[PDB]
Amino acid sequence: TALPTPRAPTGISVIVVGLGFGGLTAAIESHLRGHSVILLEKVTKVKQDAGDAIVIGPNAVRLIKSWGEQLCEEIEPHLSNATHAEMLDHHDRFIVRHELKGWFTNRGRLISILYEHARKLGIDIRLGSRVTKYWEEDGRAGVIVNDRERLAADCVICADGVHSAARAWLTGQSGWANFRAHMTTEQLAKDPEASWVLQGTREKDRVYVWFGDGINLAIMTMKRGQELAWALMHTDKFGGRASIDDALATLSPWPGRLRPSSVIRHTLPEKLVDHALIYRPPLDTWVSAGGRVMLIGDAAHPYFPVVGQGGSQAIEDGVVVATALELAGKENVPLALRVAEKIRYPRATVIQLGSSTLQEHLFWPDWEAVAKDPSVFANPEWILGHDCREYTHQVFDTVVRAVRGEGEYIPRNIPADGAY
Ligand SMILES: Cc1cc2nc3c(=O)[nH]c(=O)nc-3n(C[C@H](O)[C@H](O)[C@H](O)COP(=O)(O)OP(=O)(O)OC[C@H]3O[C@@H](n4cnc5c(N)ncnc54)[C@H](O)[C@@H]3O)c2cc1C
């Protein structure tokens, strides 16, 4: 069915904050499971950036496809035809060639498709609604919208990103930045020191990633070589500000700076951003003291962008929350959030800690171990082949007994003796 009908009304009212991957998933899955949903987002429109490429893992694709058959046909023209990424070191020397189902596509174009699909389902989405001043009573929780309107519900699902005000409220208590840019390759094609990046681009999109000396640079061609995007993770970050001279100065110490610098120096000033990255250690809890406010997504577990699972885990967060609310019922909303936390926390934390350790291995690699084995340098099956919704149905009763103290719970959505 291109438009699935929701289950019978469960009587549970849910307030979702954020139009990201966590918020949209929480709203869509909750609506289809019978919950009464309102989604609050501060922006007036989904931001569209041609240089914001993202990878969605198969564990999240299968969840998205279950919301409607047509969604695959909508994303198909926006999927990259790139198949492999060429990995080089900071001397511009080849290391290994890595692959990359899965969706390698544009962020804003995928959010727009999911947002339009949510409106076709009849979900109450309210843009231009800035949320703050979270509050909680016995039996209800809520927010304040635009400092003029009070809203209340059975629970509040906070997916407001890394800069979460809800996390600051719930808790009460890094130096990394990321350049990102998009460009058209007309002027770059006239530079012989930079025209190399257009080689074989009409055939398919090419991906180049450089690692070393605390810097990561990725260059991705698009549209038969007519456009390219790039991203640069670094610790040289000094209102907002972005300058191409800072990106070039970051690459200056590299012995193999010539080929990458010759490309990115053609970036137009108005198409370059330099955002600070936010990482925090795993939280003690995602659920408020009263039990009716819960953090999901980046608000609960920000990752280092090297695992390609931040959006997928935010999607898994929203599906499990909506599933636990359906299985618990109206009179056990606090139990539902505690159950979803105990299911999700081990899986999201293993990946969170895995991104921090993998971050060290990629920005300051042990080149002697990489020389003897580069295939390790470049995601396992316990992540990609997982079905969060079926696992939640399988262990829900066991987790309820563990939350109420009746029994034990062994998490099996993570590998035994598992680091990442
Ligand atoms: C450089 C980089 C590369 C990445 N690459 C990938 C990748 O390839 N694959 C992948 O899966 N993940 C990737 N990620 C991670 C991914 O971006 C995030 O994990 C994911 O977007 C988290 O979603 P979210 O819903 O939690 O938050 P967000 O997507 O950040 O959404 C937060 C939303 O809440 C809104 N909001 C904030 N405050 C308020 C408020 N007070 N009231 C109302 N609304 C508010 C914001 O406008 C926003 O729409 C990457 C991250 C980075 C930094």
Ligand SMILES: [Hg+2]
């Ligand atoms: Hg498809």
